[PDB]
Structure formats: structure tokens, C-alpha cells
């Protein structure tokens, strides 16, 4: 209601990358979102051997980017203010290797030109998905390259796909952790386009607009999911240590076509990222490594007439698109 | 430090091949000279590809060590940037060279028998220099080169000069005709039980300056036989009402490692102080044309005696600032 997807407790000491001839698989997930956003392509690939994967947002023209990183365990490479691709992956910090696969592939496509203005810029972020499985396989260069090679315009594989293969929510106790997925949502308003992509691996739980906990912290003894604050407040009431496992974060992107200055884009990124504490609770905690990329293709000038009404209004809309994406990941 | 007055002009950059065009064998970098130091628990390895030429330098601290990162300028190239690290990987190849850190990470995971508990994660922070203007290939530090640098790590040794990440580092990017090859550099001091190690790979837009204020590496004008401070070029452009010129692809990546226990707040303040101090030896510094990144690392081994603001961090910062200037001068020598 929704049915549980308990991850079960991890088994450590399983086989790693060296044990397999790892075969990239194109991730299709549970269903395909289709959208109209020329110049923005998405690819997703996984290793069944994990299972673990990578999701690549490819913007071949390059696009201005703001990064908003929060919590105590961020796993980020590049974090550039201009990107040709964003690579999201499992495997904790080891999975940043997938982004090197994307960077090297883009250098090849550029016929190995290395002038400073031709540098192919990939920002990468990762989730700790080793809790959700019993292997040590992680996204490697080959998997990042595969995700890029599978990238097509206007498609996103919802659910257990790419970086979302082994994403999970609700880390108060691993016995109550549930598999999430990745999610995406898209809106067009006049000529304005907003795409949200998210891979929620939070310490917290996914919450819908009614306040219902819909994924994470499921107790098989009760058949019910609980907001973590109730666990935490009873630990403090009982004067016992609260418990929670490390290895959490949400990694996300907003892509829009609206021209924004560097200041507007950074403020927009912060607003949208804070808004995600509506659908993920708690969020931005010391136990999380939350990283949001806000990307603009700089195509549309909004009509007007030092503080940006347009960034605030766009931020409010983009916040709703992102909440929709979080709910798709949890579905 | 007897800096060689002779010029080492890089020359103008050149359609060259990339990594898989070559059968790349890592070479253990020995540089011009070995620094020997006494700091158990800290090892340095340096590897290069002749075909670049380009390389990587890895500082390996297997215990793990608390770290503060201080990043400045408009072109920083960083991976991880963790507050706790088992290794720091410094490399050429611009952002492509961040791959070398993935090689270090994967090797450390193999050494840990593929254990993946959160507390057992092997944490590598990586930073890069743009060294493509100093050569004629697209070769960059890859996983194999990072792994090789880690495998070459020797306790208590550092190869000075054109070695590891320093192989194609360069200074003075007002005009590529006046750019000179630098190198990497290290210096070490022991004071009572305090140990301070500085490592630097200067690829600055600016020039290396000695304690007398002499420009000793970068911005060498072969028409005059002397190096001058970039400010002279910039002020002449503005006085002439013509655009100043300067090439992109600059930064200095560095580490300061000490055994003195510091809180996260002290360590971050220490990092900022030491990094700012490097504007003495590198000028200009922390510019929008640079991607300057300093890692300040404590191995948390000794408590300094005491008598909300840290005198110990300030005093240690002053001494570490001198060790780092010495390291910059060894890179430029
Ligand atoms: Na797509
Ligand atoms: Na050493
Ligand atoms: Na220690």
C-alpha cells in the first residue's frame, strides 16, 4: 500500500569487479518517461553482477551549472560550473570511476583536442548502494562509457535502472530499509522546459504531498512505514542512543532551458534542493551526502517587469517537478 | 635554494595522439634529486608516461587522516575533496587526469579484500593541473598510472623536479612564449616532535618568486634575458588601453601534512592560512585564471602543550608556510 521492497541486511565480503567479465546492460527500468527537450540526452547502464549502475545526462553543447552539496558524506568529482555531462552512479566513491569513462569517451569524440575551451567537463556524484546487495561490484569506466553510448533524447528509465538499481531509503535500521530507484519528471509551461532527475538513497524516507510515508523505514512486524522522527524521539524519551547507518544521500539534477545568471542559477539550485526536504525526511543531515546539479541550456529569455523574481518563480515550479521525480523513484 | 637561472621555456603547444595510441608503461619518476624525510605513515609515489610527458604523484596515508581542502580560482579540478583521506592524488591531464585517483581507489579496495563497509571505504582526493600546453599529445594520467604511483610509493622519499604530476607543470601564462617548465617540489621540517611535510605542483598563471622578491621561474622574455613580474605586463596593457592577455590552464595543487592534532576548525583555518601564504612565492595567485587547491592533512599523532582561537594552529601555520615556500622553490629550481 505500496507493497514493501525491503532491501534486507547487506552481506559484506562478496565478489568485486575483478571476479567477473562485467557485461554492461542498457537499463530500461519499470517504464520509460518520454519528454521533449532537444540537446539533453539520458543514458543508463547497469551490471547485473552488482546489481549497480550509472545514469548519464549528456548535454553535448555544454551547459552552465550550479552545484549545491549538503550533509557530511558528499561523493563528488568535478562539480564544474559548465558541463557536457553529469554522471550519477552507485558504488560509493569507487563509482566516481564511471565519470572518467564518460570524460574519456567525450575526448575521443572531440578527436583528442585538448585546448582549454575544448575540455570535456563531466561532474559525477555517487550513492553508497553496498547496503542493498551482497557484492562489491561498482560502476567502472566501461559502465560510464556504456551509459553515455546508450544515451538518447527524450527518454528516461524509471525505477531500478542506472544509478537507481540499488538505491534505498530509511537507514534508521537496515531491517527497515527499502529499495527506491531513480525517477524523473518533466514539465513544459509555454516555452519553459524543466526536467528533474533524482536518485534517492536517503537516510530518511520518501513522503508524498499528503504527508504519507510512501517508501523507507518499513517494519515487517507492523506492516507500516514510520517517519524516522518517531524512532528518534522514542530513543531520546527512553534515554538510549538513537541508531542510524551511514551510507546515505540523494543525488539529483534540474535541467531547464531558461537563461539564468550565475547568481540566479546558484540561488535556484539552493531553493530547489531545500524544497526536497518536503519529499525526503529528514534531509540534508550529517548522515547524508546530498548533491543537486542545476543546469541551464540558456535558450529562453523570460519576459521581465538585484533580486530575481524569475529564479524564485521558476524555482517554485522546479521544486514541484523534483517532488514528482522523487515520488517516481519511490513508486 | 640555488634556483638555476637558465631558462626552461615550454614552447608553444601543439593534433597529438591519446592514451590508447600508445602501449603506456608507467615509469617510476626519480626527478633531479631525492628528498629524504622521517615521517612514518606518510609515503609518496610518483609515476609518469614518457609519451605525454605527464604524471601523477600519490601521497599514501594508510591509517587515514583528517583533511581540510582549500580550493580557490575559477578552474579548480577536484575529485572527492573528503574530510578524511587514505590518499591524495595529484596529476596532470586536466580533468581527464582525475582518472588516476580512480586507479588509486580501486587498488586500495583490492588491498582491503573488497570490503565495502562504510567505515572501511578507501577515500582518495584528487586534484589536477592542465599540462597540455607544455606538450604535443593528449595522453593523460589514467587508472594504471594512479595505481602505479601508489605501487611506487616509498616511505620518506620524494623525487624533486620533473617527476610525477610535476613532469609538465609550467609557470607564467601571460604569454606562452614566456612560459617556463616548473616541476614538483617538497620540503620537510622537524621541530621538537612536530613534523611538517609540504608537497606542491605549481602550474600557475603567475611566476615563482624567492624570499628577496626576485622572479625565478616563469615569464622569461627571451628577447631581454630576464623574468619580470606579470604585473609589469598587465599595467603596460592597461596604460596602453589595450586588452591584457593571459592563457587559461593554470593552478597550483598542494598538500601540507603534519603530525600535530588539530580540530576540524583549526585544520580548516590552518589550510586557509598556509594557502594564502603561497601568494608570497607565487604571484599573482588565487586568480580567476587559476584552479588552486591545497589539502591540509593531520595524522593526529601529537598534542602540542598549551598555556576559542588557536595559537597552536597559527604558529604551526607560520612554520608550515615556510616549508611550503621551500617546496615551491624546489619545484622552480
Ligand atoms: Na533521454
Ligand atoms: Na615518501
Ligand atoms: Na593518525
Residue carrying C-alpha cell 594504471: B144
Residue carrying C-alpha cell 560509493: A92
Q: Which residues of B touch A99 (CB under 8 A)?
A: 98
Q: Find the chain B residues whose C-beta atoms sit closer than 8 A to any C-beta of A.
A: 16-19, 74, 77-83, 94-96, 98-99, 101-102, 105-106, 109-110, 113-119, 121-124, 126, 130, 132, 138, 143, 247-249
Distance B164 CA to ligand 3 centre (A): 26
Contact A119 B94 (CB under 8 A): yes
Count of residues for chain B? 333
Strands A41-47 vs A25-26: parallel, antiparallel or unpaired: antiparallel
Select from B77, B102, B115, B128 the residue whose CB has the most chain A CBs within 10 Å, as the one to mutate to test that interface: B102
Beta bridge partners of B252: B202
B82-115 burial string, b = 16+ CB within 10 Å, else e?
A: bbebbbbbbbbbbbbbbbbbbbbbbbbbeeeebb
- Return left, alpha or beta for B65; rule: phi > 0 is left, psi -120 to 50 is alpha, else beta: beta
Under 8 Å CB-to-CB from B324, ≥6 apart: which residues?
Answer: B187, B198, B200, B254, B256, B274, B277, B278, B281
Q: What are the phi and psi torsion angles at A42 (to 5°)?
A: -130, 135
Closest residue, chain A, to B249 (C-alpha): A116
Beta bridge partners of A254: A196, A294
Query: What separation in angstroms does the CA of B289 have from each of B11, B36, B129, B249?
Result: 20, 34, 12, 7
Contact A94 B106 (CB under 8 A): yes
Q: What are the phi and psi torsion angles at B225 (to 5°)?
A: 75, 15
Residue carrying C-alpha cell 557536457: A84
Residue carrying C-alpha cell 572501511: B120
- The count of domains in chain A is 1
Query: What separation in angstroms does the CA of B159 have from each of B57, B114, B167, B244, B330?
Result: 10, 31, 11, 37, 10
Q: Which residues of B touch A79 (CB under 8 A)?
A: 78
| A219: exposed, middle or buried (Cβ count in 10 Å: 0-12, 13-18, 19+) | middle
Look at residues A166, A108, A187, A179 and name the one whose alpha carbon lies nearest to residue A141. Answer: A108
Q: B21 is written with which cell numbers? A: 595510441
H/E element, A318: helix A309-330
Q: What kind of experiment solved this structure?
A: X-ray
Q: Which domain holds residue B33?
A: 1-333
Contact B99 A104 (CB under 8 A): yes
Q: A159 is written with which cell numbers? A: 525505477
Q: What are the phi and psi torsion angles at A207 (to 5°)?
A: -125, 135
Task: State how far the Cα of A226 lies from the Cα of A11, in Å rounded to an integer.
Answer: 25
Say if CB B56 and CB B46 are below 8 A apart. yes
Q: Which residues of A touch B130 (CB under 8 A)?
A: 116, 119
Look at residues A109, A249, A96 and name the one whose alpha carbon lies nearest to residue B122. Answer: A96
Reduced to 3 states, what is the DSSP secondary structure of residue B106? helix
Look at residues A289, A283, A12, A250 and name the one whose alpha carbon lies nearest to residue A131. Answer: A12
Contact A92 B116 (CB under 8 A): yes
Strands B84-91 vs B124-128: parallel, antiparallel or unpaired: parallel
Reduced to 3 states, what is the DSSP secondary structure of residue B78? strand
Q: A137 is written with which cell numbers? A: 561490484
Select from A114, A249, A286, A289 the residue whose CB has the most chain B CBs within 10 Å, as the one to mutate to test that interface: A114
Largest CA distance in chain B: 64
Task: State how far the Cα of B272 lies from the Cα of B277, in Å rounded to an integer.
Answer: 8
- Number of helices (H), then strands (E), belonging to chain A: the values are 5, 20
Distance B62 CA to ligand 3 centre (A): 9
Strands B291-302 vs B282-283: parallel, antiparallel or unpaired: unpaired
Size of interface A-B (CB pairs under 8 A): 109
Amino acid at each position: 500500500d505500496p507493497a514493501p521492497r525491503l532491501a534486507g541486511p547487506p552481506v559484506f565480503g562478496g565478489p568485486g569487479n575483478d571476479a567477473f567479465d562485467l557485461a554492461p546492460v542498457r537499463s530500461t527500468g519499470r517504464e520509460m518517461l518520454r519528454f521533449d527537450f532537444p540537446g539533453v540526452s539520458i543514458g543508463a547502464a547497469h551490471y547485473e553482477e552488482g546489481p549497480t549502475g550509472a545514469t548519464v545526462i549528456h548535454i553535448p553543447a555544454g551547459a552552465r551549472t550550479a552545484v549545491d552539496a549538503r550533509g557530511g558524506a558528499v561523493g563528488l568529482s568535478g562539480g564544474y560550473d559548465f558541463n557536457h555531462a553529469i554522471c550519477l552512479a552507485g558504488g560509493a566513491g569507487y563509482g566516481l570511476e564511471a565519470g572518467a569513462g564518460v570524460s574519456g569517451a567525450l575526448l575521443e569524440r572531440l578527436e583528442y583536442r585538448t585546448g582549454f575551451a575544448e575540455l570535456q567537463l563531466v561532474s559525477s556524484a555517487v550513492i553508497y548502494d553496498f547496503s542493498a546487495r551482497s557484492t562489491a561490484v561498482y560502476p567502472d569506466k566501461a559502465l560510464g562509457r556504456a551509459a553515455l553510448e546508450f544515451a538518447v533524447p527524450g527518454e528516461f528509465p524509471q525505477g531500478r535502472a542506472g544509478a537507481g538499481m540499488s538505491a534505498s531509503a530509511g537507514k534508521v535500521d537496515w531491517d527497515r530499509t527499502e529499495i527506491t530507484g531513480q525517477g524523473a519528471a518533466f514539465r513544459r509551461l509555454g516555452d519553459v522546459r524543466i526536467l528533474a532527475v533524482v536518485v534517492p538513497n536517503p537516510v530518511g524516507v520518501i513522503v508524498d504531498r499528503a504527508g504519507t510515508v510512501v517508501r523507507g523505514n518499513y517494519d515487517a512486524q507492523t506492516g507500516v512505514r514510520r517517519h524516522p522522527v518517531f524512532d528518534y524521539q522514542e530513543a531520546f524519551a527512553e534515554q538510549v542512543p538513537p541508531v542510524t547507518e551511514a551510507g546515505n544521500c540523494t543525488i539529483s539534477a534540474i535541467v531547464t532551458n531558461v537563461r539564468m545568471s550565475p547568481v540566479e542559477l546558484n540561488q535556484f539550485a539552493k531553493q530547489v534542493h531545500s524544497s526536497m526536504h518536503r519529499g525526503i525526511q529528514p534531509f540534508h543531515t550529517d548522515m547524508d551526502g546530498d548533491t543537486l546539479f542545476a543546469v541551464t541550456t540558456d535558450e529562453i529569455d523570460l519576459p521581465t517587469t538585484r533580486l530575481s523574481v524569475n529564479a524564485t518563480a521558476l524555482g517554485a515550479i522546479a521544486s514541484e517537478v523534483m517532488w514528482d521525480a522523487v515520488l517516481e523513484a519511490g513508486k
